[PDB]
Amino acid sequence: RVPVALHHRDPALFCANPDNLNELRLRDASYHGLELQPFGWFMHRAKSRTGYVGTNGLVRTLIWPFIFKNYSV
Amino acid sequence: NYATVNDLCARYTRTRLDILTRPKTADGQPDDAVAEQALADASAFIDGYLAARFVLPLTVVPSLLKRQCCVVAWFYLNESQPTEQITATYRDTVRWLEQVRDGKTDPGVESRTAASPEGEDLVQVQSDPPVFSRKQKGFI
User: Which residues, other chains included, contact A39 with Cβ-Cβ below 8 Å and sequence gap of 6+?
Assistant: First the structure.
């Protein structure tokens, strides 16, 4: 029983739990949000900077130079 | 014409208007067509002085233009021997019309509804279609 296809879902579909702020939960129009079904969600959290799941992305650092460069251009 | 003879004979006494008009007619009796012709010539004068920055078949007539037509018609009707004051007031209204043409003074409005006469675009510029302007919400 092995995987036959790995579909990359859009990252916007996942909202972090308001509690413990480190468990990605599939959005289901709920306050807590639907948790991930076990053994069915390949999650890779690449933490370049220590912190929570939303913080550790490089978009937090790169949004400012992006804005400055594109406005200047 | 901007002003009717019934207004020129009110601002200026009708008896003096008859005195000025009765020689000019062919018969020699008081006439009304002479005054209307003078008013038409004065209205043509004002029209020429206003067509610089207005659509000349005026949608709304400024209320002072009746006075400005009566004075010019009166001066045009005293061309043989005018009083000094008539000449001075004619020079004043020519100065006012020059100021209106230049842009120093607007003619006014219709006193009934305070509407200013429209006119063609004094200033008009055309450029190539705008690209990379801030209105292009793309990119950014």
Answer: none
Q: What are phi and psi of A54, to 5 degrees?
A: -75, -25
Core vs surface per residue A9-33: b (16+ CB within 10 A) or e: eeeeebbeeeeeeeebbeeeeeeeb
CB pairs under 8 A between A and B: 3
Contact B139/A at CB under 8 A: yes
Chain A nearest-CA residue for B137: A71
- Region of B54 (left: φ > 0; alpha: ψ -120 to 50; beta: rest) is beta
User: What technique solved it?
Assistant: cryo-EM
* Residue B105 to residue B68: CA distance in whole angstroms: 14
Resolution in A: 3.6
Find how far residue B111's CA is from the centre of its chain.
Answer: 16
Query: Hey, how many other C-beta atoms are within 10 angstroms of the C-beta on B105?
Result: 13
Tell me how close the Cα of A46 comes to any Cα of chain B, in angstroms: 28
Task: Give the gap in angstroms from C-alpha A70 to the nearest C-alpha of chain B.
Answer: 6
